[PDB]
């Protein structure tokens, strides 16, 4: 309804200063050609659902890197606020050490480009975007503020799109690795339908 | 973020002819005031990922209705095509009898209002939307065509939003019924952060 | 009143997926240079007048190919719905095996280019267009939904336009093969009018 | 599909001077509310296909009036040119006495409103329009200049539209008085499909 | 007030089908390079003032041709209507054989370009135009419909313009061949004034 | 056809200072309600064709007034120049005493309203206009500068229009008082045609 | 407020037919490169203040030419009216023989370009303009109609602008030839101020 | 002819802070209704021609007030600069005591409204304007910067317009109190012309 | 000079969430009617010059309140980031306890309204604005990021504007309490200039 | 809110006539490349706060030049008024001899380019601007009219920007030469914060 994120088309480009391993570093979309990217926005540092999502994504970051997919969090908070939140104990509502970059969208350019800027507060909705190695947006997930996302589902979706990318088949509802796929044509698909019904 | 679909604001109204228990009947958003609605678009009848999703939601329809949530599927196919597909056995790629309405969007207005129309083909991306009892859009999920969605995740989101609605607390990442929630303010949130860290 | 179908001008170009002898094939207007084409739109698959027109033309398909004229049916339904209709028995309202191509206009682009889209329902009126070997539109016929067309009249018109194409004379009202024509000039035309009055 | 002439919409109103029984008279569409109307345009008086269509319709005018349908011919020629042509013997390419009004569209407004004006010559294509008693346009037929129309087909169409108006059924392809009709709902339509297959 | 006819500027170009010696011929202004032209519009064939003007100019056609001036009539009627009128006897209101071309302006282009189209009826006023051998318009005459023009005056004007073209003198009011003219400069004009007063 | 001068329409209104019987007085079109008006423009005072036209009309003014027609001359020159010219002997190129008003169009509003201004020189062409007692324009006559008009033809035109106004018949070509007129209908017009042919 | 005459800028070009020593001659502003020009407009020939101005400037013309300055009169009257006025004795309100050109601004362009056109009457206000040898406008004087200008003042101004052009000093109020001038800088200007106070 | 300053029209309104007898005071055009106003702009305080003009008017101020005319000087300089200049002795290029108001056009609105703003420098040309008791502009005078104006000519003009206002006669060239005037009509003006030629 | 911030006009209204005594509270300009306001923007929380400015103002907060002036700091950081910074010890680069509100401007509306937003970074320049008890903007101070402002100067300006507000005198350069003021008129100002020179 | 002066961007270029050492001279920003510039606007010559700021800056001019910083004064008054004020003794409200240039902004171009024009009066607010040697604007100070600026604070700001320019560190609040600075990165800034807290 706003912005430029469109399925099947190049994801909007972005550059931003991020906190990588306690240091500041420029992070641009072009750095991730050939790799999948899970880009997830969140409203505000030093809040409540926010740390649980960032922590949950950090702990399982390697599950995504095992598949060739980097995970990136982003909010309108500055890199100094990100760093401060990282230097805050998790017991205190902080993030602690982090295995994922934390981008600063202080110009709101990313949140506006991805159409997740809650304009009346100036903060980003819980928007999650899956971008493939070719730079093409494949999935959109936006939650209202009071409900956090699921890292299980984000992994399931990344796995799904990577599978159909290589093997030319499609993933049924609920597909997890090891589940049957469907050959997307009228004749070859009868194999699947007769087996599972 | 979808055509007229804006999280936090009223969901785009819709009125359509649907197949309901093997017969044609009008379906409107106004019929579900006071109830949650899970509205999922799908591209085409008589294809591949499509039947697995429609069957998955139909099989779980009553799990949603116990929570006061109604599941509605929709594509640009006519109600006559819907009925022919329902009268096709699942062993043949058909839908068999269904426990959820199947709306017809032949004018493509519903797809356009929800910003999910793959313009170059005239069909709807796998856009799923969660609306609460007050008619407010709470959740946007849109997949590219080759990957199905998750009924479990859709049910988790409905449950989470119904919980935050009732108890004024926010749901952490991966929340599921019985999991702990956070009191969203600086003082009362420490209860949660210290417990789980 | 809408579209680009103008008599005496090149027929609006079209490109579509069609079900040809049970399989999917691309169909272009350029494929039919030197041959006549009867392009007939119909509203919806799995309806009532629709199957009778498609079956009628399909049966008489060779009556047209003998004259070097291909017959093409089109609706906004997809090629998957077309095939499912072909695989339904005619006794149940289906098409059965088909001797003509059935094109899919899921983008509604053909129906808009030929100005036959019923905008309020998103379906095509019963529009029928006769195109000569040079790609020029020679005839327009559009019926409101409740009344089917006539295959006999369509054939009579194809025969009359090819005759005048070949001999430069003009066909009177009700002309059928073997009836007298008129030489279109003041002097020679009197041969006809003296005989027939 | 013709200028302001749109199927299912009110036919464009018109007012014109006509020759009626060898005399001049004003003719308006509103004069025929409650009756069906066949309005056929034609390019030029004192030409070749033109008299055969006008004569044919005149000869069969009473067959249409038995059905409550009035026939009207129109061209851009004036009423004085019409009258001189009526006063020319049919043996000599004239019209002789006529039993149908003959309207003069000297302003070309009727031809422009019904979208049949061949602009490069300023004359009307062979456009025929069937309008019901309610003033709603039900059928559009337009031929290129070389080929005349069929009065039998126009009569078949008036009959069919009057049958569907009164009974609420629909007319299959090729329907004539004495042919089976279809009841246009999924269940009742089966009566027809098993009888005729 | 309308059109492009301006004294002292190139007369609007025109090209039309015409009846010339009972046969159809294309006629265009560029055919008359170097010759004077009298172009007279008249409203309708088979009317009343019209034939008397057409006959009067046809009979005097050679009077104009001896001066290198070609006379052209034109109305919005078709060439076929012209020809049918030429083949009507003058005793019956016809034209009989003619010595001047009769142009057919079915597109109303000539009438519009020369600003003589009575819009509310689609017919030309009695506009007469005199054009010199260089293509420049010298005289405009337009009569309301109920009053015919004067061929004597048209000839007088052609004579006057040709005399002034050659000798650089100017023609007093009522001038005819043989009358005194004025040398248009202050000193030499006294010759005329002192003699004629 | 001139600026706002349209045949069959209310003549453009005008208001001017004029020289009348040697004195200045305001003249306006509303003064001549119920009387015919011959309004003739001329380019410039103290030139050559101009005085011959003005003097010719002044000498025959009473021939028009007997018919209830008032003749008015107009040029862009001022009333002071008009009066100096009236006071110049005719032997010297002057007008002498006048029997018609001479209007001063110093603002060029009359020439612009009547579409007779020669823009590259700021002077009026030899435009002549006949307005009936009802204020309607009946005749336009515009000559290029070198050739004067004919008072004879203007009187004939006034007589013709007055005759058609009173009797409802129409004046043929070259009609003069005493000539036969035509009753403008198909049947009654045969009296004239058979008589004169 | 209107036009293009701006002091300190190139005077607007002009080109007009004029009366010079009893004959018609073209006059352009470029004719006067290297000389001063006093261009004075006046409303109407054969009026009242006008002749006294034209005569005053004519009698004093040589006083201007001795200084290299040409005087030019202009009005919207034609050169023929000018000459007629020149050929009218002064005792009768005429100009008699003139020693200055009299330009004819019949198109009102000169009056428009110099912004002196009294629009509601189409005549020129009493605008006087002093152009220097380089074609630059140096002085503007415009009087309402009832009050004539001063030839003495115009001469004083020409003399003054020619003094400052040559010596680089500037002329005080009321400066006449022989009066003191001021050196335009702070220190040298004190020579003047101490002297005269 | 200056910005909004038009002869024969209401003078552009103005309001300004002015120095009046050593003190600051608002001065408006509406203060002078019923009185004549001489309003002269000048470029800059503490320059060279400027003081000679201001002193000349100040010294003659009462000669104008005896006629019911008030003299106002204006420049873009502030009222504090005006006072400083007044407090500067005349021997030093100052103004000394002043008998006329000095307006401060610091916003440059007066100079712009009167079309005398030399834009490239931001100062006013030597524009003098004469306004009658009705608020109507009667005279415009504008010199380039190097040449000063004439207080004698300004007084002559005021006397002349006041004279023509009272008596309805017009003032010839160079008129001064005591000189003959002309009765502005053709007949009465002869008195003046025969007397003076 | 700042977006909507203009000296001498009402200051841009603002409403924001601020940290006030360790808690969250709304702050709006209307709360400060009758009191002076020093509103100082700063780029980012957890940075370097920023805390020194906030601490310097916090330490002097009462010095402004004794003068009826409230100090307010604002950045684009959220109130949660503000509080985290407040709960960080000063020796660590934190703010520690504070005695001035810290407004959050995460919609950037305050910064944009006061024209201090560094657009390419999304953060506010070091803009300080002084607002009087009546809500009028009296002073603007904007520093590039590297250089901090001076609380002394801010206090001096508040004292100065309150003094001139009360006594209607003006404060010379460098004015501090005890220093002389000037009576702003020509006469009374001489007291000051003679004393101090 | 108006103009083009933006911190961090090239200062608006300017060029003006100025008074330097009692003589007129052109001053332009390009003349000060490599040097800091303090450009201070002031409303009006010969007023009250203004002379105290000009004299104060003139007295301290060398303190700025020892730093490589030039001071320029500018108002809308002309250079002739600037010089007159300089030649007025300070005891009388004058400026006396000066050691800084005084620019004349008679076209208001500089005041408009720097956004300090008080449009309603045509004078400049007390806007002060600090430009570094590269031409970049570093500081904006604007005071309402009744309160003068501080030459001490201006000198402080210049030193701070020159220090940060040279040493890359950043100046805390109240920094004066000799005080400690901050190293603007998270780690190195701790040096400062522990020492001073």
Curated annotation (Swiss-Prot), chains A, B, C, D, E, F, G, H, I, J:
Catalytic reactions on record: a hydroperoxide + [thioredoxin]-dithiol = an alcohol + [thioredoxin]-disulfide + H2O
GO CC field: cytoplasm; cytosol; extracellular exosome
SUPFAM superfamilies: Thioredoxin-like
Chief place where the protein resides: cytoplasm
Enzyme Commission code(s) on record: 1.11.1.24
Superkingdom, taxonomy of origin: Eukaryota
Keyword Acetylation: yes
Key words, A-Z: Acetylation, Antioxidant, Cytoplasm, Disulfide bond, Oxidoreductase, Peroxidase, Phosphoprotein, Redox-active center
Subcellular location as annotated: Cytoplasm
Residues the record lists as N6-acetyllysine modifications: 195
CDD domains associated with the record: PRX_Typ2cys
Modification Phosphothreonine, positions: 181
Phosphoserine: residues bearing it: 111
Pfam families for this protein: 1-cysPrx_C, AhpC-TSA
GO molecular function: antioxidant activity; thioredoxin peroxidase activity
Coiled-coil intervals: none
Active site, renumbered: 50 (cysteine sulfenic acid (-soh) intermediate)
Domain Thioredoxin: 5-163
Keyword flag Lipid metabolism: no
Summary of subunit composition and partner proteins: Homodimer; disulfide-linked, upon oxidation. 5 homodimers assemble to form a ring-like decamer. Interacts with TIPIN.
PANTHER family reported for this sequence: PEROXIREDOXIN-2, THIOREDOXIN PEROXIDASE
More about this protein: The active site is a conserved redox-active cysteine residue, the peroxidatic cysteine (C(P)), which makes the nucleophilic attack on the peroxide substrate. The peroxide oxidizes the C(P)-SH to cysteine sulfenic acid (C(P)-SOH), which then reacts with another cysteine residue, the resolving cysteine (C(R)), to form a disulfide bridge. The disulfide is subsequently reduced by an appropriate electron donor to complete the catalytic cycle. In this typical 2-Cys peroxiredoxin, C(R) is provided by the other dimeric subunit to form an intersubunit disulfide.
This protein's name: Peroxiredoxin-2
Organism this protein belongs to: Homo sapiens (Human)
Lineage: Eukaryota, Metazoa, Chordata, Craniata, Vertebrata
